[PDB]
Amino acid sequence: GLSDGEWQLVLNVWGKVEADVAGHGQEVLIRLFKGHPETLEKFDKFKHLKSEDEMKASEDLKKHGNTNLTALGGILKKKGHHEAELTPLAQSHATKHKIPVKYLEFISEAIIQVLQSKHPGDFGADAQGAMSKALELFRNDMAAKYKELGFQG
Numbered sequence: 569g570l571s572d573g574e575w576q577l578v579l580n581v582w583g584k585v586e587a588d589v590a591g592h593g594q595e596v597l598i599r600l601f602k603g604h605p606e607t608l609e610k611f612d613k614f615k616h617l618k619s620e621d622e623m624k625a626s627e628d629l630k631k632h633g634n635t636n637l638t639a640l641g642g643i644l645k646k647k648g649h650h651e652a653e654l655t656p657l658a659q660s661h662a663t664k665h666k667i668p669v670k671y672l673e674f675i676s677e678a679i680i681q682v683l684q685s686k687h688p689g690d691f692g693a694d695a696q697g698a699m700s701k702a703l704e705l706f707r708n709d710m711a712a713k714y715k716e717l718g719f720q721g
């Protein structure tokens with residue numbers, strides 16, 4: 569449901585992410601974990617990170633944040649016609665990782681907060697609005713796929 573102008577705002581701010589995918593990734597995850605501690609429980613590899621300092625030093629945390637945002641980016645660049653990128657992610661997330669739609673809302677908030685904190689200047693009212701819509705569309709399509717698969721949307 570985004571307009572062409574809105575997609576261009578999304579992809580323009582995403583350009584900032586692409587310039588440093590792993591650092592953005594690391595910060596989104598740490599924001600996620602620090603704002604909603606229970607999400608940390610879904611990552612067996614990360615149960616020994618007992619603080620932010622531990623989370624910043626973790627090379628697996630950073631690798632994972634890189635993997636995550638790289639995927640998100642492939643989805644956003646498809647501007648809605650993302651069915652092929654989205655399916656495998658909703659498959660793995662509904663079955664293998666057991667991630668509820670609710671946690672997708674938490675990570676969307678952390679994504680927005682990181683963008684806002686690193687790129688105030690480029691992440692104005694219209695960019696904010698458009699990114700919010702894009703992430704909402706991502707969540708909604710993940711939710712619809714989860715229901716088809718027999719899971720809770």
Ligand code: HEM
Pocket residue numbers: 607608610611612613632635636637639640656657660661665667671672675
């Ligand atoms: C923007 C939303 C998200 C994106 C784009 C994303 C992307 C990815 C990708 C690309 C992978 C590796 C391939 C795969 O298993 O499909 C992955 C794995 C994983 N994701 Fe997500 N993810 C997101 C949200 C979440 C959230 C919110 C959680 C939990 C709170 C989560 C938990 C995991 C776990 C536990 C794994 C496996 C990690 C491992 O041990 O290697 N994901 N995610």
